[PDB]
Design an enzyme around this catalytic site. Sequence first.
Site, PDB file in Angstrom:
ATOM      1  N   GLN A 195      -5.046  -1.955   9.463  1.00  0.00           N
ATOM      2  CA  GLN A 195      -4.696  -3.202   8.796  1.00  0.00           C
ATOM      3  C   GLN A 195      -5.282  -4.346   9.646  1.00  0.00           C
ATOM      4  OE1 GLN A 195      -3.089  -3.767   5.768  1.00  0.00           O
ATOM      5  NE2 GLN A 195      -3.897  -5.825   6.194  1.00  0.00           N
ATOM      6  N   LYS A 202       0.807  -1.200   0.000  1.00  0.00           N
ATOM      7  CA  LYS A 202       0.000   0.000   0.000  1.00  0.00           C
ATOM      8  C   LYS A 202       0.862   1.282   0.000  1.00  0.00           C
ATOM      9  CE  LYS A 202      -3.856  -2.589   2.161  1.00  0.00           C
ATOM     10  NZ  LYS A 202      -4.711  -2.858   3.398  1.00  0.00           N
ATOM     11  N   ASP A 251     -11.139   2.616   3.575  1.00  0.00           N
ATOM     12  CA  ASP A 251     -11.533   1.240   3.209  1.00  0.00           C
ATOM     13  C   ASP A 251     -13.024   1.090   2.934  1.00  0.00           C
ATOM     14  OD1 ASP A 251      -9.262  -0.467   2.843  1.00  0.00           O
ATOM     15  OD2 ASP A 251      -9.038  -0.718   5.019  1.00  0.00           O
TER      16      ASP A 251
END
Lengths: 285, 282
Positions: A99, A55, A122
């Site tokens: 995460q 990422k 997200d």
Amino acid sequence: SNAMILIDGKSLSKDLKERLATQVQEYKHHTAITPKLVAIIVGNDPASKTYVASKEKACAQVGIDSQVITLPEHTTESELLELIDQLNNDSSVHAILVQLPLPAHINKNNVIYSIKPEKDVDGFHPTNVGRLQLRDKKCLESCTPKGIMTMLREYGIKTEGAYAVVVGASNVVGKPVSQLLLNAKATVTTCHRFTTDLKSHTTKADILIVAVGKPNFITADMVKEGAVVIDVGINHVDGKIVGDVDFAAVKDKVAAITPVPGGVGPMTITELLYNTFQCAQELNR
Amino acid sequence: AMILIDGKSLSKDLKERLATQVQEYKHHTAITPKLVAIIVGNDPASKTYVASKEKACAQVGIDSQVITLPEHTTESELLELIDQLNNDSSVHAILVQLPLPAHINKNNVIYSIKPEKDVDGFHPTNVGRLQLRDKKCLESCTPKGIMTMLREYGIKTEGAYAVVVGASNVVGKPVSQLLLNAKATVTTCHRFTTDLKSHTTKADILIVAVGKPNFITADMVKEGAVVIDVGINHVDGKIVGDVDFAAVKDKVAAITPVPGGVGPMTITELLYNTFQCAQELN
């Protein structure tokens, strides 16, 4: 004869990152704002470190700033909520990602709910999940479903009046992609492990989305001639990556199909980058 | 062997069960649930609905308060009041009677309600929570009622093929999500669906929510289908379902009549939601 088009995610992701880089530099020139992503990792999980690393690399490629905050495994949920509260009120931070997986002592849903929806890059916050379904425009859409729709758009695959069958009903993919398809005016069937006679559904699909994490699960006899097949599987099989669709078998039958690797997988992080840019612009509107 | 899925009788039974649960809760905690309902203006249908919600609260021992504002009330004035109620701990559940006047943006009003007090369940957080299986979800009343009907009548949802006709935010989408959570295979159809009949004729469970009188005919339904008719259409001085009941009744395993089917379950589930708000708040 069938089109047998390869829906090439690696090439599409490359084009999309280049396009995004140009837009980010334009935005920076107009506003002096560089979009910034903060990724939080709790503990040491190896696969998690690798995901976060991918990422940050993608960010660098397109000129987006990133920062990883690594917290010890022993961090409490209250402590993580405290950090997220500081990030939510820090105007230099546009996008916040946690995460997964988190340690056993932390509930991921409480953690996600503490993130401002406007920074929830997200797209996992309930308000973003709800705004997706409710066709509302502040919605940060989940990256993998967004990526799927992006492939369909860029390849010119018509959704209006199409019959789409989504195999797998997960929160991260199956249910949000079914909702995106329905907003795009497809008729949508969502199947899962309790579905009886799966083949009776999948064989009628114009658009078939496969998201079950079962290597080579979907075989040729389950797919309609002329179908568009999107394979979301990333299965690790003896060092190889293999999809949920038996590609060798099915590819001769289809109008188009995503390979694995190099299909949906690279689109997920690409859409994370677009979501980060969306966060920066909408915070500064 | 056809079963009438009778909402009037089921609602009565469910309210009796709730009244006992509410009394038990009050014995243990001294808390009685409280619903606040806001009505803007004087639409007579809106007034009738709000009066029915107060009556239903009184029937199960839930406290209710109605705040009536005039029609020209501004969106900002309504949002001020909602903020007050969000932060009043005597208030467990907040509802705004719809339709609002045309000058007020409903979505902004809905968003301003605290999700954990949003008894109607259309706040985005409640919509997302339903899809996520989050136990804090306030499920919207009509979809919740439809699932209650299926459950109380012993209709199997695990592995059933369910087709939902109508993809509205108010009914079709949330009910589809509830059915999926209940382990049914679910198809959602709408005005852009081609060959509608090829789907609806396969459904073990057919939920119809299109607001078109007599829209579903016998040729569109499977033999042995369970049919849920969410239509309340005012036509020819009459209340008519979205399903042509007379036409389909001799071929289905079970069906909701209109009126007297889904309609009564809507307020019933409001009361259940209000009691949910009181227990979670505490």
